[PDB]
Amino acid sequence: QVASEYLGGPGGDAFDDKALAQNGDITRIEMQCTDVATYIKLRYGKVDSRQWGWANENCIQWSKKGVKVVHELSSGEYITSAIVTYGKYVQSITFKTNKRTLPRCGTSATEKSVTVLIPGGLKYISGRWGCRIDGLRFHAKC
Template sequence: MHRAFSSAVILAIGLSGGGGRPGFTQQPAATEILGGPGGSSFSDSELQPGARILEVHVRSGDRVDSVQMLISSPDGRTVMSPKRGGSGGRLNIFRVNRDEYITGVSGRYGDYIDSIRIHTNKRTSALFGGPGGNRDFRVEVPAGNQAVGFAGQAGDYLDAVGLIFASIQTADVGQTTRLVGGRGGSAFLDRDVPPGAGIAEVRVQSGDRIDGIQAVYVLPDGRYVEGERHGGSGGQSGVFRLDSDEYITGLSGRCGDSIDSMRIHTNKRTSQVFGGRGGQSDFRIDIPPGSQAVGFAGRAAEYVDAIGLTYGERDTWWRRPSRRGSYRP
């Protein structure tokens, strides 16, 4: 059975503490819910402001018996969320790292959820459950969001499952442009951008398509910080360095199932073309006037499948450092 969660779920979830932890906006919503018709409906709607998922507990045998979360509250206490389902099967624990957040679940289902995997911005869990089920499923949160709980139907087993999600709150990153490209890979977002940082250079791995992309930031005191690399390490290495009074305003190129080629646009110039000659359609992404890009968003695995920009107001983000030379790793 394919069922959709028809209404938004309003949670009182505020910003998490410092140290680069994922944080949430205050009005999460729910993905579609997939699975069978049995059990009673549930929704993880009691998380405290600033809560963070530490672990996901999955009990499973021939099917998924239950799911449950271990949560860290803002005052440092750890709390178990309600168990969704029964007590049968074997306990499996998937631990979420400090810089990690859940982006989706996948598996197989029939009358119940027969198997499940957990997807994060970093990796995919082992498969929990059995080989049964008559349909594959994958539920993903929109780019720029993270899962903050489960929703679904449960009784003695986990009958149906979906995710409660909310926007990833950063150091006032602001907005995200539309994404262009394919639907493969896992969602990513440059969310841990230091306040006052500017993009000093963009590293691009490319061959016939865009393999990987990474931003390097310069801080107000002139120090450099590497952002997370998105995608694979194949292809040739290319670097686009920005001047001290320069900032990124857009991207353009060609895309199909992945990003085949890309140019970077700034307030002063346009970069060379990175990538190949393929793709089914041209694209161009521009941020609003008075803004500057502060990072990338999209989907990636072995290649960059989809791309967009995160941006903020220029006066808020850019503080010109007292010195700025070329970055060298």
């Protein structure tokens, strides 16, 4: 389907939830959040992805870690906007749904910002990951 540009940098390893998204609409968002977002993990229907970020605990040498944040989406709730600040990595992620605006993950927003609108709702994410979220790309439903 239609996708945003890739937002972020070339570090880490590529991931792509395309195949996983065949299991359903996004029903859950989990992130690890300090001054920056250090991982993201969505649920597609009843199927969780791997943890995209915070590859290991020694990553604390190179950034802060953060707290685990979980947002459960209701039936018919979908993500219609993502405000991302980013450079070498994704710094912060602010998701808005058709029902509510979620708090930003990553308290610092000093990097370049982009607002991506996703009419009909986000279908899935791809990107790159390691100790943190090297980058993200947003994929729509068609």
